[PDB]
Design a protein around this ligand. Sequence first.
Ligand SMILES: [Cl-]
Ligand SMILES: [Cl-]
Length: 162
Amino acid sequence: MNIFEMLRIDEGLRLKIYKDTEGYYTIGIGHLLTKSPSLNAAKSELDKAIGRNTNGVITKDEAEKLFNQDVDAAVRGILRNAKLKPVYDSLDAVRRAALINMVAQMGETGVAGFTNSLRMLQQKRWDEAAVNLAKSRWYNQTPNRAKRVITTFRTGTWDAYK
Ligand SMILES: [Cl-]
Ligand SMILES: [Cl-]
């Protein structure tokens, strides 16, 4: 198991523009296109992202390319983030993947907002962190995905994904 496989399980793969759980225009493997309510705006961000008139449809390779870019950016964003970096550095390889997952789903800003949980993670207080992570909108809006990530932080294994 690795970050790519993990997010692929969590986000699925869709080759046509679709709406995510929050109703935002997305495509591929969870690649947010825009928060604007306009399809046209979404189709426009899409072509710009891919570099051609796609007409709201991409190929598998193209999806994967966005995916690679997304993962890399998530990592780099964590590393440049003063709040996140320290946590990430304190974690083992499996738990780092869990933090990347949250960043890919909710953005750096979002994650950096889990101040209390981050501190517990840094302190290696697994059970307490998992309880705190659960008290959030994130957990209430996407409970299945959140349970998988939380379990990963709690156990340090890939069990929730096997
Ligand atoms: Cl892009
Ligand atoms: Cl879910």
